[PDB]
Design a protein around this ligand. Structure first.
Ligand code: CKH
Lengths: 167, 136, 349, 193, 401, 282, 173
């Protein structure tokens, strides 16, 4: 994995730069407060979207704004069983978005999972722990997808033998 | 039901509105003679900052990317350290430009540039990649 | 010297004349006033009137009046009647949240920057017994994030989300008289644009006029600090930082600046008048008989973004103590002379 | 100018020309506070919460006052509710049980602009206000438009003023300019409060 | 379709399963699952048992996934449905619409969790989650006392843990007004177990509950008046004092005991909780009155005319009778004081009893899932995939109109 | 439970209860039950003509005529004999138990009643096993549409008997989990060298069927079992039929338990992420 | 609710706040003479088995205090009666019990001092003391024709079981 540490470093530094947020009232609608990267009603409040890619398939998209940051991840999916496990695990978490609270209910078109960190989050939580968590998450969903692949294969071998051994 | 379809904000007279490349041959010249650092500093010259065509900018990126890949891992720290702060910040911008075009494991060595470019410019240079209105 | 008033962010703060009381907005609709007693802080007042989050507070020293502005588009001038602060409404005539407010040095006017892309200059009219305001609109195009008055109480510096730092004339001939000449210009009619920065990127979070008012500084989201010298044809010295953006800045001498932001600690900047160059003076927050004895994963006093800085004593000409409040609900008091001992390598000016 | 009043009882668009009211040109809207509270109760049932229209009316009203608002761009508001959790808020009931309210915060008030939602005929307050001023003294219109004032409890919804202005413009642009977005910046609308 | 829908009612103590159309559950098993607990690999997750088979497996631990009518362990609950479907019902889940039940006040999120399991684990083609109280009302339509269908009524559900008085209006439970009573089947057993200890000698200590539960289920009932009852048992003890005989667990010997007073004393603690609970004293008749008075004035009478019973603890002979008499005394008294302090219209109080009370919920579900309308109000797998699991937050009530 | 049970529990628990009460001498209660089994099977247990002293058990299969064309009627009669009466309208096979005339060992007829579905399939297998054991080759293969869109082919060859299943995976992702299991079956000999050879073909039927109107599709999967004399002979026969007729439902059963186990993994991991996320709070 | 007395007559006199109810008895005391076929001691013995289970009892009038006292006492008689082998020994121990001086309103040891008015003077003290003794005596002798079944030397277990239960959670002991 000569390419994993370098990749996670670039991604971490970008997130450190992007998570510099502040509370911001709406210039467009009176008494409304909204994440600018989502509504995008004021171009001057949106930062430049940047991408960090490890290879053609794995990458992270970071879209900043004055009071919010959208983070999208393209997860490593080597084969079919990995594609469906990832897609199931990602949906699993998104369905529990209200408890995750920094999770988007749907990913940005083209990615597997997206976070939506706001100034309210950076006010209540150490932004460096949030950066830590996004890196930890990227490493852990890959380990879990691998453990899941092993589990399914292992149980299938036993299921096939129990049936076959009974003839 | 028809009239709520048009975005009237688009004509809000209170909105916000913001205010030709490196020498292709000069770069090749340096690259062909194996003078990498020279090729880098030459490619980081007169960037298509104020140009309107998305083609001119992509052309400039291609040249910069072509130089970055041509490098040898151990010869990255040296070249980066021969740039003035404004150079590093432009480099950083190009490094993030390349990430949008992975291929032949180009991203692998680009992550090496990003590492060194960061060690020289700090997170500040990445910040200046995000805040830019006129980009590469 | 750190103290924690709460865990949520301190939206903004303001000290009274004696620096014996501090008003703060504990990330809500109120303003709490704390007073020191021995070495503890006690809450003496609670100003409830705003219908929205309080975004700015300023305390006129001589007249002892507090002015607040909020996301509810209002502004209030608070007057102390005996033992209780009484508010007075000020129609700002804006339809978006107010973001910042500052009393002019002459305590005759106060300015409110807002999301309406305008600056509301307010003054009182005795004949009708209430406050009125005029608008400095052009050429502001986005939300006004920061304000700071020139010592003559006429020139006004402003930083907005359209990436510009500007100096205007907030001359109200009905409460003050013709302003003396300034190196920024001779003609200062109301709303006159005296100066405009050239940068095309970077929200301007903070702006500050020097003690004599001939120099103006500001920090942008692009991790840079700038200083425009009026006595040099408004030339601009810029210094691109290698770290995170700064959100607040102040002068501590005519050639010294102290700033803080998303890195969570105060840093020093020095201006070389001759070379017209800004230089990094170093981080100011580094980890007797009682001292020798006595002596989250952050090595800084504040544990989250520092959003405001203010001089406590010694003014902007020769500051001896300054204050910082932040998104971590803390308030720090820094002593300039101590910081000089602990760091021999430290300059200043 | 024009006074748009909406309370717990009903909504009225009362025009007033240099002096007094003009019963002619003064229309009513069959939607108000009580109706919005009722719709919120229906929306909260479709969310899995057991609210009774008569037993918990006062409890849902208090939820409406503290959490509801008027969306500016509905299409954009539904995206926030559908793709994110920024609109979700917790609310404790008198017995201590906690519920979570999201999209329904702007969905209920929307009835004011789209009557069919609560199944009532007519057009939205915005469209009603437009019509009123149009079929009136062509030499007082511009005066009326830049002098609209909201009053009543059912008009304090965050963002309401912005929403009205956005629609009045959308109605103008076409129903009096045939889609010509050229002369649009010279249209002055300023709603007080 | 040619195939009937599956009806599964998971309660805290027992789970009732079967096919729609039938009058009674095809199975009634304890809501427990036994597993090995001493990281999981291979197929350790499939190595388990449920119901009676789980209660005493030598090398397995027994877990109860449901507490207070709510799922507290989704991992276990999901495995439990694996056997409910493939071992007992033997239904290919993809070919059957399912009807599940939930206690009132189950969070909307729990319904999404249920839907995730049914649609994504078992791929069911359609799902409906009904609230138990409402099915209980539907069940009462089988009674002769009712000639008009209606889903407005007060449900008195008493199982073995706690008793619930649930007001319901037009198919929707009035949650803000629900009240719970700390007197259930188990309490009736403990009290009876206490009465025996003070009188009958010879009952094997280790067989204390056994005997008490037996007496409760075989000889208990509700009486109209305690003194006139004690009086009977003394005037002609021959007719009222029954006998019971059990066998000593460790000696297979045979012991007999007289079963007297507890026959009517046990069930009595519903109407006089103070007899057994030092912390609760409200008679069940007063709780119902309170709950109904806490509801909208305009729905109070309909509630009084349609109080429905549900659960085993309501099966005692004359339970309804005693409840209705007591409720009519409290309500009529109130109207007396009023008229005097001055003439209200008499309020009709009616407790409904029917044959399907024991498993009223399952029966209501079974009958409703047998109708054509059940197939329209169900959420299909196609709507689950397009719109999402949030569509299971609400289930259109049906059956009346 | 790894292997699926063959006997239907509703039938057994219903007959056992009625038989126990009949023997106790209790007045017979009425019975009326409708239930199902895997693959479109509908059962009905009732009292013919209201006579509560008689209990009937009927089974309905949409494809019965196909099993019948392969000796199903004869086999069921040998097995049930006098209990097998004329089929109740709507069903294909009916068993009648007289509560007033039960054998001495009732726990033996109850067992066979629980296997009604299994016995209906038995004949087709026995008929082709028999062919194999008699060298009769070239005999037309049996085609049993056990589900609206699933078919089972049986054919006897000189030294081997092959059973082919054409199965559908409605859920697109179930095809992928299925492939994982099918791959393990195709390598089963590496664990049981004497067991049947299993083949798997995704989207297309084995070439011998490429000419019939066999189904082709992204969600179709063909599984082939090759049974050898040691499996088809008179000694193993019953056990072998008990396994092979449950295979289809065994495979789909395990794919679904596989997904349920993945869920417990996701619950544990998602739960752990949330604990870490919350430690980012002061 | 619990079982309350109905012997409170407008002519019924009082001793403290306890109703001085007439009883049919030979024993001495200030208890009036009852002519009717039922007196407070009967009413208390009849209702006993029921009332004894109640924890709360609403005092509707002074007769209920008298009724409550007999109830608590009947419980005291069962402790003793529980341990004896004859309707004879019971009567002899039931006599001794009745003579023993138990606590009275106002004195510590007497539960319910908040519900029973104490003797306002020495005359009331002796009169009340004697009335309570008379009630105890009559209740005691009247309780043996019940507790024992024709099989003498046998206290019916259907009366011996209530020995562990205390009306309103109080006891004269
Ligand atoms: C349960 C409850 N308590 C109330 C107090 C005041 C007004 C309404 C209510 C309700 C009914 C609405 N709540 C629910 O349906 C609910 C269900 C599950 C979990 C929490 C809930 F609040």
């Amino acid at each position: 994995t000569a390419t994993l540490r370098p990749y996670l470093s670039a991604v971490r530094a970008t997130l450190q730069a992007a998570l510099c947020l502040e509370n911001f009232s709406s210039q467009v609608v009176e008494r409304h407060n909204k994440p600018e990267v989502e509504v995008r009603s004021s171009k001057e409040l949106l930062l430049q979207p940047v991408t960090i890619s490890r290879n053609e398939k794995e990458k992270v998209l970071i879209e900043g704004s004055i009071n919010s940051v959208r983070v999208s991840i393209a997860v490593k999916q080597a084969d079919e069983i990995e594609k469906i496990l990832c897609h199931k695990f990602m949906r699993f978490m998104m369905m529990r978005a209200e408890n995750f609270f920094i999770l988007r209910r749907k990913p940005v078109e083209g990615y597997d999972i997206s976070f939506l960190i706001t100034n309210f989050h950076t006010e209540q939580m150490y932004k460096h722990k949030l950066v830590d968590f996004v890196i930890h998450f990227m490493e852990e969903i890959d380990k879990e997808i691998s453990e899941m692949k092993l589990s399914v294969n292992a149980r299938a071998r036993i299921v096939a033998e129990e049936f076959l051994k009974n003839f | 039901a028809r009239f709520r379809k048009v975005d009237v904000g688009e004509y809000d007279e209170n909105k916000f509105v913001d205010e030709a490349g490196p020498d292709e041959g000069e770069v090749d010249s340096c690259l062909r003679q194996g003078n990498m650092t020279a090729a880098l500093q030459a490619a980081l010259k007169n960037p298509p900052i104020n140009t309107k065509s998305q083609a001119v900018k992509d052309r400039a990126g291609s040249i910069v990317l072509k130089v970055l890949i041509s490098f040898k891992a151990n010869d990255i720290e040296k070249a980066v350290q021969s740039l003035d702060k404004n150079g590093v910040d432009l480099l950083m911008k190009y490094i993030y430009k390349g990430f949008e075009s992975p291929s032949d494991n180009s991203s692998a060595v680009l992550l090496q540039w990003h590492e060194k470019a960061l060690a020289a410019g700090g997170v500040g240079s990445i910040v200046r990649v995000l805040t830019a209105r006129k980009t590469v | 010297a750190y103290h924690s008033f709460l865990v949520e962010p301190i939206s903004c703060h303001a000290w009274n004349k004696d620096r014996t009381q501090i008003a703060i907005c504990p990330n809500n609709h109120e303003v709490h006033i704390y007073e020191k007693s021995g070495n503890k802080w006690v809450q003496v007042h609670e100003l409830k009137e705003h219908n929205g989050q309080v975004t700015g507070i300023d305390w006129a020293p001589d007249s002892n009046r507090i002015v607040t502005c909020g996301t509810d588009r209002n502004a209030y001038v608070w007057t102390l009647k005996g033992r209780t602060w009484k508010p007075t409404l000020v129609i700002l005539r804006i339809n978006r949240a107010a973001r910042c407010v500052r009393w002019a040095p002459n305590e005759k006017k106060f300015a409110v920057g807002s999301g309406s892309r305008v600056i509301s200059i307010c003054y009182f009219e005795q004949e009708n017994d209430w406050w009125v305001c005029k608008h400095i609109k052009k050429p502001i195009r986005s939300t006004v994030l920061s304000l700071d008055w020139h010592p003559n109480s006429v020139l006004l510096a402003a930083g907005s989300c359209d990436f510009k730092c500007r100096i205007f004339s907030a001359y109200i001939k009905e409460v003050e008289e013709r302003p003396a000449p300034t190196p920024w210009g001779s003609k200062m009619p109301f709303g006159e644009l005296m100066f405009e920065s050239s940068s095309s990127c970077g929200w301007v979070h903070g702006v500050c006029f020097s003690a004599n008012g001939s120099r103006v500084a500001w920090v942008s989201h692009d991790s840079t600090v700038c200083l425009a010298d009026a006595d040099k044809k408004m030339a601009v010295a810029t210094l691109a930082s290698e770290t995170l953006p700064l959100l607040a800045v102040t002068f501590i001498t005519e050639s010294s600046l102290v700033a803080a932001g998303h890195d969570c600690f105060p840093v020093l900047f020095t201006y070389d008048s001759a070379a017209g160059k800004l230089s990094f003076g170093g981080r100011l927050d580094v980890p007797t008989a009682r001292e020798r004895f006595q002596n989250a994963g952050l090595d800084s006093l504040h544990k989250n973004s520092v959003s405001q800085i203010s001089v406590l004593s010694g003014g902007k000409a020769k500051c001896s103590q300054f204050c910082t409040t932040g998104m971590d609900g803390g308030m720090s008091i820094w002593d300039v002379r101590s910081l000089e001992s602990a760091l021999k390598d430290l300059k200043i000016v | 100018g024009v006074v748009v009043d909406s309370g717990d009882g009903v909504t009225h668009i009362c025009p007033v020309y240099e002096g007094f009211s003009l019963p002619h040109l003064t229309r009513r809207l069959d939607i108000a506070g009580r109706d919005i509270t009722r719709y919120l109760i229906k929306l909260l049932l479709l969310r899995g919460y057991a609210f009774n229209h008569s037993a918990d009316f006062e409890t849902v009203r208090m939820i409406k006052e503290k959490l509801c608002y008027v969306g500016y761009n509905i299409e954009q508001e539904q995206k926030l509710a559908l793709e994110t959790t920024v609109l979700v808020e917790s609310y404790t009931l008198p017995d201590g049980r906690i519920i979570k309210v999201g999209g329904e915060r702007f969905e209920a008030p929307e009835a004011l602009f789209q009557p069919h939602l609560i199944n009532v005929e007519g057009v939205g307050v915005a469209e009603l206000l437009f019509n009123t001023i149009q079929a009136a003294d062509i030499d007082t219109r511009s005066e009326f438009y830049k002098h609209i004032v909201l009053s009543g409890g059912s008009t304090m919804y965050p963002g309401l003023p912005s929403r009205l202005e956005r629609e009045l413009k959308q109605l103008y642009l076409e129903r009096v300019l045939k889609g010509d977005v050229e002369k649009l910046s010279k249209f002055k609308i300023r709603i007080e409060d | 379709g040619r195939l009937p829908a599956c009806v599964v009612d998971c309660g805290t103590g027992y789970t009732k399963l079967g096919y729609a159309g039938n009058t009674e559950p095809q199975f009634i098993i304890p809501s427990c699952i036994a597993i090995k607990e001493s990281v999981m690999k291979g197929v350790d997750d499939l190595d388990f048992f449920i119901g009676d088979e789980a209660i005493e497996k030598p090398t397995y631990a027994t877990k109860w996934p449901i507490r207070h009518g709510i799922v507290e362990d989704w991992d276990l609950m999901e495995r439990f449905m694996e056997q409910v479907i493939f071992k007992y019902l033997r239904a290919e889940p993809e070919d059957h619409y399912f009807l599940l039940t939930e206690p009132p006040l189950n969070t909307p999120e729990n319904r999404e969790y249920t839907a995730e399991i049914m649609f994504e684990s078992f791929n069911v083609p359609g799902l409906y989650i009904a609230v138990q109280a409402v099915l209980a009302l539907a069940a009462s339509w089988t009674s002769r006392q009712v000639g008009e269908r209606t889903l407005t009524g007060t449900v008195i559900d008493s199982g073995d843990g706690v008793t619930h008085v649930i007001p319901v209006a037009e198919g929707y439970v009035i949650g803000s007004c629900i009240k719970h009573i700390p007197i259930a089947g188990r309490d009736i057993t403990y009290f009876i177990q206490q009465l025996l200890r003070d009188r009958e000698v010879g009952i094997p200590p280790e067989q204390s509950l056994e005997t008490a539960k037996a007496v409760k289920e075989r000889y208990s009932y509700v009486c109209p008046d305690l003194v006139k009852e004690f009086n009977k048992y003394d005037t002609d003890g021959s007719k009222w004092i029954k006998q019971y005989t059990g066998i000593n667990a460790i000696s297979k010997k045979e012991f007999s005991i007289d079963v007297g007073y507890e026959r009517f004393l046990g069930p009595e603690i519903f109407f006089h909780p103070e007899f057994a609970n030092p912390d609760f004293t409200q008679p069940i008749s007063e709780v119902v009155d309170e709950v109904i008075q806490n509801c909208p004035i305009d729905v109070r009478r309909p509630l009084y005319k349609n109080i429905v019973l549900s659960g085993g603890s309501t099966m005692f002979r004359d339970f309804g009778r005693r409840l209705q008499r007591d409720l009519k005394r409290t309500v009529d008294a109130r109207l007396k004081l009023s008229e005097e302090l001055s003439k209200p219209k008499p309020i009709d109080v009616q407790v409904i009893t029917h044959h399907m009370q024991r498993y009223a919920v399952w029966f209501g579900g079974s009958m409703l899932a047998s109708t054509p309308e059940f197939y329209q109000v169900c959420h299909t797998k196609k709507d689950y995939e397009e719109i999402g699991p949030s569509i299971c937050r609400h289930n259109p009530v049906f059956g009346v109109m | 439970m790894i292997l699926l049970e063959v006997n239907n529990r509703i039938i057994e628990e219903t007959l056992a209860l009625k038989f126990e009460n009949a023997a106790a001498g209790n007045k017979p209660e009425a019975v009326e039950v409708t239930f199902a089994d895997f693959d479109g099977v509908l059962y009905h247990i009732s009292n013919p003509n209201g006579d509560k002293t008689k209990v009937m058990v009927s089974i309905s299969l949409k494809f019965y005529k196909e099993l019948q064309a392969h000796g199903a009627d004869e086999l069921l009669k040998r097995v049930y004999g006098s209990y097998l009466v004329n089929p109740e309208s709507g069903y294909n096979v009916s068993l009648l138990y007289d509560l007033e005339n039960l054998p001495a060992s009732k726990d033996s007829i109850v067992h066979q009643a629980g296997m009604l579905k299994r016995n209906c399939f038995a004949s087709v297998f026995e008929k082709y096993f028999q062919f194999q054991e008699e060298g009769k080759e070239g005999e037309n293969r049996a085609v049993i549409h056990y589900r609206d869109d699933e078919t089972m082919y049986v054919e006897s060859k000189k030294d081997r008997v092959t059973v082919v299943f054409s199965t559908v995976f409605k859920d697109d992702d179930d095809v992928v989990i299925g492939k994982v299991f099918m791959q393990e079956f195709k390598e089963g000999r590496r664990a049981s060298h004497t067991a049947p050879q299993v083949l798997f073909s995704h989207r297309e039927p084995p070439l011998e069927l490429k000419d019939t109107d066999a189904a082709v599709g992204d969600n179709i999967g063909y599984i082939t079992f090759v049974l050898f004399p040691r499996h088809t002979n008179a000694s193993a026969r019953d056990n072998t039929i008990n396994l092979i007729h449950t295979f289809r439902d065994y495979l789909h059963y395990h794919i679904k338990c596989s997904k349920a186990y993945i869920h417990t993994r996701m619950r544990a991991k998602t739960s752990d992420f949330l604990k870490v996320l919350n430690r980012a709070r002061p | 609710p619990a079982y309350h007395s109905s012997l409170m007559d407008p002519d019924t006199k009082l001793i403290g706040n306890m109703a001085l109810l007439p009883i049919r008895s030979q024993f001495k005391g200030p208890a009036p003479r009852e002519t009717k076929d039922t007196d407070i001691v009967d009413e208390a013995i009849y209702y006993f088995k029921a009332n004894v289970f109640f924890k709360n009892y609403e005092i509707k009038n002074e007769a209920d205090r008298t009724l409550i006292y007999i109830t608590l006492y009947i419980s005291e008689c069962l402790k003793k009666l529980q341990k004896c082998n004859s309707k004879s020994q019971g009567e002899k121990e039931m006599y001794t019990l009745g003579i023993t001086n138990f606590p009275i309103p106002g004195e510590p040891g007497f539960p319910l001092n908040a519900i029973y008015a104490k003797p306002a003077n020495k005359q009331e003290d002796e009169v009340m003391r004697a009335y309570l003794q008379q009630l105890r005596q009559e209740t005691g002798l009247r309780l043996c024709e019940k507790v024992f079944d024709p099989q003498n030397d046998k206290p019916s277990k259907w009366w011996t079981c209530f020995v562990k239960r205390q009306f309103m959670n109080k006891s004269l002991s």
